[PDB]
Design a protein around this nucleic acid. Sequence first.
DNA 1: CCTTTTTTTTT
DNA 2: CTTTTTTTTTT
Lengths: 1168, 450, 92
Amino acid sequence: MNVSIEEFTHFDFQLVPEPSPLDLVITESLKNHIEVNGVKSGALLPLPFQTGIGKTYTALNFLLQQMLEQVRSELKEKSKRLLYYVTDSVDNVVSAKADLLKLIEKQTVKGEPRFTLEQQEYLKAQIVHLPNQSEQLLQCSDAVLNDVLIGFNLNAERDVQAEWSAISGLRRHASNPEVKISLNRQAGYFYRNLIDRLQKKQKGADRVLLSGSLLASVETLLPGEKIRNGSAHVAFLTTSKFLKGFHNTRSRYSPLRDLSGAVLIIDEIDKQNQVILSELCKQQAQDLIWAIRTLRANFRDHQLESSPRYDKIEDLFEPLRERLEEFGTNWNLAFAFNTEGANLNERPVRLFSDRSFTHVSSATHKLSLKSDFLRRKNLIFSDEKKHGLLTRFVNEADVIYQWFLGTMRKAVFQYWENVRGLEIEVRENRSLEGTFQEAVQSLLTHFNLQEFESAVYESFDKANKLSSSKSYHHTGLKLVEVAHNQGTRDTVNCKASFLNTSPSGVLADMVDAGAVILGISATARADTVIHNFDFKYLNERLGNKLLSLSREQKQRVNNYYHSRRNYKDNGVVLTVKYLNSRDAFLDALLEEYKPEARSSHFILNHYLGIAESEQAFVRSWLSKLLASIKAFISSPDNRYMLSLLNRTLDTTRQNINDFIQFCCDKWAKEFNVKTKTFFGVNADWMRLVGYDEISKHLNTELGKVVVFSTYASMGAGKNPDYAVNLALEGESLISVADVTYSTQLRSDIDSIYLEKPTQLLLSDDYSHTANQLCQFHQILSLQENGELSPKSAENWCRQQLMGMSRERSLQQYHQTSDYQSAVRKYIEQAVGRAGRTSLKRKQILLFVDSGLKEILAEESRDPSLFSHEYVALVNKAKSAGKSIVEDRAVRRLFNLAQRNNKDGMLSIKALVHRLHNQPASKSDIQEWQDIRTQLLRYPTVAFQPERFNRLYLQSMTKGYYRYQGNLDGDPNSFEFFDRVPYGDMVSEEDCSLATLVQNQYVRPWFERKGFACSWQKEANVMTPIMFTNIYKGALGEQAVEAVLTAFDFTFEEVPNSIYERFDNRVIFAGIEQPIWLDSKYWKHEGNESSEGYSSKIALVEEEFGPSKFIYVNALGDTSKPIRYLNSCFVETSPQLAKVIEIPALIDDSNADTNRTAVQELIKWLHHS
Amino acid sequence: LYYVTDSVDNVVSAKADLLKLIEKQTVKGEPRFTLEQQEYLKAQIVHLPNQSEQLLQCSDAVLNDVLIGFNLNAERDVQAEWSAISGLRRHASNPEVKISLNRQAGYFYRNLIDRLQKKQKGADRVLLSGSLLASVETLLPGEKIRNGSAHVAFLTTSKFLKGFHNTRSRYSPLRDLSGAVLIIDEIDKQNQVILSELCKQQAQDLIWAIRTLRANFRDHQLESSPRYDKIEDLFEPLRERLEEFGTNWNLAFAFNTEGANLNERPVRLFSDRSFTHVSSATHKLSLKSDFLRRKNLIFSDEKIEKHGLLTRFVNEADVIYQWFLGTMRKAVFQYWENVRGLEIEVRENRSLEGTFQEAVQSLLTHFNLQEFESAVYESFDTRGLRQANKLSSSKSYHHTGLKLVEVAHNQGTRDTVNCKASFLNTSPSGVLADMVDAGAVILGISATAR
Amino acid sequence: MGMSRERSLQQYHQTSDYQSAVRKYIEQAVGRAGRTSLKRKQILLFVDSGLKEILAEESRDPSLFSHEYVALVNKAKSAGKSIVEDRAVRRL
DNA sequence: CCTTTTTTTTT
DNA sequence: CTTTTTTTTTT
Ligand SMILES: Nc1ncnc2c1ncn2[C@@H]1O[C@H](COP(=O)(O)OP(=O)(O)O)[C@@H](O)[C@H]1O
């Protein structure tokens, strides 16, 4: 019996629950954004909320509030706005849903109930909890499934009834973990087939009109149908289910394509960076050779129907059609590829690529690619002693493959616009999701490309040019393996695995789609990119859509947390101790345990199972662990110790367990304690009935409980508390809340040991390729931030490709400043998990490793959002031995200065080479103009530009800086700023633009085109490689023409076969022999050797026979006479000189035009 | 030697009676064999059941030896699935449990063997011997057959038409029948059994297959190495026919049916391939290439137009598709005589069965036709015993066959059609004759055998 | 076009193929109950009336016919001799 | 207008 | 140099 909206017609929407300082924060930052950035824009508001004072409560109270708000609009009236609540763990998701259903019931406004019972039925019917397919099946009764099987005529198939018999046969014999593990695998497979047949029988021809018990049975089995049907607001799913989508009665709905208006309420947002990365590293690897050959063959003549339903789609594939033909002709795709040249066949070749400056390869010799014509086979070979290189082919082939996939997405979007207007039978599914199924099918069928069906479906969820906003976070690494195919012995396949975007890029894509994502986590703005999103990229990409909190709002939160946690005025003590290696302390204990052995080392190898390899480490985490144990036993009032180690002390290493068990029992007797220890408490242990047992012991018994867990084993949802009895605990407890929210007599831990967090480098275990992408993402995300200079990041990526031990990987991570903010994120969570109960002890102890004393002393954020128990852990470290600085932001600048230079050196070298082929592409020339147009119009930009971010270089000095490095050599050896105080200055004085603009001819020309006359005094100065090679080279080019403009000389476009080889085509004087140009800025750049120059003449002598040349150098010394040089470019007589070299046109002393030189030049071109 | 029957309860009974015959043999009043020869003869017999029951017979010790001895105890899914199989066997009989146990046993066996086959046919040859040999041989009865420890087999007719596994790949007894000796109990009942296997072939889209063949064959070429000598010539007539066929019917466009009485019911075109041609459409359907719309339109014309009939197109398309598959079979045989001795060492397994999987791989990769691997593999399970319609050779239905074609709109897209052609390229009587013509000596023991 | 399972069997009945098919079931459904040697002296056999005409057409060589199938064919053959279709003449 | 039970293997 | 659990949803 579904419930209508008639009860909300009498609802008093004016009446509202009383807001909270935590509640006001969420709405305050959102209302202003809506009235500034528009209504349908989106936002990425993070909220740094402490875990104890109201994360859920406020999170779910916001989710409920949006549920109530939409109902009023629907009642006052269209599709409901979705309100996903994405988390990481199923336990947390179900707990959040249960609390929400709890909240709808017992929430009382001003002391009286708010929701009538009927309203609760309506609101509860809007919430959904879509689980995985396996658990979805083992939730509905046998009657519910039988109605679906009978009502859809699926009982007449042998396979369907055979499977369902087994599922019903097994689920009846439940209650045994051995059976439980196979009912879940079996349930998932049957669920796919049952829904697949349900969708096949429903999407075509016959369509069952769902109603009555068939609707309830089909909605119970398909909760995603409740959303598609049209009565469901909220979904309660994990991140993995959000990234994989959920079935409705028609197809598989993906929320990533329907984000416009979504209100994602992602909880513990920082953890989703690793979760989203696990979905991205789990994509299928595609053969590049097969895909490119298949695309080339099915495109040369495979027309698409000329109907109004496919207009403008034939044009999106035209540039791809020509490129595929050109690509096939260049690399001879009619043949198959195969390696050659032994010392290349023993092991495969892996070719990492950033699609940018980082281009590490695992073949120590550069591999060429020759196209043999006698033996009809493309051969990959090595040449130990160029256009035809293996890396150039694979990069070119990858660009085309993603060009097709990119074009495929535009065609699908174009198709939807063609059919949205056509109102024939499109039904309610007129969105890009309803037509995605069809638009991909129709286009892949006409082109015969049905093999790419999966690769297009699974990938449907700012290019790599210097004239764009380049970044790794909308780009990706590309791991390619070139190994022999299976079975056949003389062919290879390019098994390419892509990472086309990043979890931070994915998060930005959600907000740009229109999502209103809310980040609810304490460490939601950490200064690491390994365990979080890059919030410096998300700041530049989103801009003002990345909402923040003002001074008063973060000050208001601290006051709220200071009230609900009033530690000092009520009276408590936070004792903090730092524990070192205490070899003497542990020696006495080990001797006293088993003194009969020769020495303590025998105890290590007899009763502890430790050799002379780990003895230095095991002692370190045993001496520090035990020393904290006895200090807890010294205090009788405290009776709860949680040790958060990194190694799971359980039945595995039980030899250690009994030694520490004996030490706890030994100290118990001499301190008058009946203590208890709870060993082996890992994720398995709390599951069955585990962590409730520890609560019961402190509920009734008298003693001290010591718990040995790990950081991983205390992820989230775990509530380390217990029920307190005043008979058990006397005046030890004391309330800290200024007011009194519900009681229920609960306490929490009062003394926790915090060992150093280790193994902070992310990992994946899905496959070897699956974590290969994960490890390469981490290296390239540290380099993009600026933690690693490109010298070391490329070194790390080269080792990562060849093969490294996990110890080597972590030793590189430890060397960066990202690792400090990573470990200070683990602690900030571990300390924050113990403050979930207001009613607290007075003597709260804190013991942490001394390997963290220096790390903790580096914390430098604002306590205005910190917890009460973490500032105490950091204040002791501040009031300690030494307090120094690490200069976080200045070592970042030295790396981003080095990085942007390396990008210019690598991209420009590729742009020039791609201009050395005939013809030059229209984009390539257009991009070349924009590089020079922006570079010399804006010599210094005020802010950080969002369109030419690799052109510039942030400097510690305004308007200039000093560098030192081989400008035409290795870009990894550059040094900047104070590293080289005697280097080459990149100021405006060095280029001497002031002398150039003093001229009466140059100055007027710049004003018309806006070219700079002076450099501003901002810190975003130009790159070194793109100031001498692109800027001074182009500054003279404009200066030369402007001087020669006022002498009846006009210049035209160089043709598309010698572009960039010559400045401009010169006309006038009436002479048929065309006049060319070679413009430079002085004689000290552009050597232009005679052999090199003679090469340029031949390529243009073939063009138009005889030719003339001029070697104008603009600025310089005007005193030196002109010279007359021959085609051999050595010396000759004047009248037999093919080329002429003018030393300068403007004086470098007082900026005087070379009137005599041009007059002879004017006279010379008349004679010639 | 094979003892092929059609029921599982009969082969095990025959094997059991054979084992008793060796033990209980009172020739001249004394045992025929000594106490040792019985073990040698018993080792030569092998019973090959389905994969599901082959798994549920080996003990957990045998599977542990294989999983540990192959480094498979690291795959994070092999151990996950093997945990469920181990955990489900320990329970009682419970027929509800057993029906689900046999389902998962077969799937796990398939997944385990292909991993055991990718890991063994590569470079890290595990050199199966010792107690690991008795473990795989127990899990793979069709491995002692490949190793020469046994020749006698005991399998059902379906297992004889599906093939069994060894450490390398799936061995099909049909393709290696020269010199065999089949013994078939109730031979008459195998006509129904073989026909049931021939009706399980997968339907192939004719429009996709012909368009795919035409696109790849136009330019993609084979290597000029000695291993592909005179193989390019086998495909030359097919290339010209593919180009001529594409030009005649305008294969650059897609096909679609337009007209009344053509969308409420799809057309079905049955054909004997010689003289029995029946169409489900009441009136003849023409096929016109629209150059303005860039579409090929199957339509019903209410008014004989030999040029441009739908039946003529499908018949020609079928002939070309079976021509490629027929040529594919000749190329595989041609490949195995250029590499039989001229390859010189390199690889043992010198047999049209061992070379067949590689020769299919190399040729389909050079032509970029890897989507036809399954279709080529299945066609050998039907016509492999081979390597007409010419009123100049033996014309009969028992080796010509029948073809059923379904022309309906494609899935998801409302303006294209596909010819899902289901074939019966031979008959069980033809299959039996091909088995005899391959060199097998067949014994048919049945009262109503004639 | 789609025919009822009845009409499939009706078309099969009109052929002489169906007559040699039913006489294959009987010849096996009777030889299976003959695997022993100890037998009663009154082995009875009762068969349907719809099989007397079919069983009277059996004319193959009796040099391998079972004892129980022979006795099943003579009784239907007792009604003199009946003209047959002469299967060859209608096959040509 | 004849009048069903039964089977194996891979997925 | 270096110090591990654990987590989801597909097929
Ligand atoms: N006014 C209130 N503010 C915050 N929490 C409240 C309030 N009233 C009741 N609660 C309960 O206290 C709990 C505090 O949330 P909890 O999960 O302990 O911390 P957090 O949500 O910050 O992790 C909520 O679950 C909520 O049900």
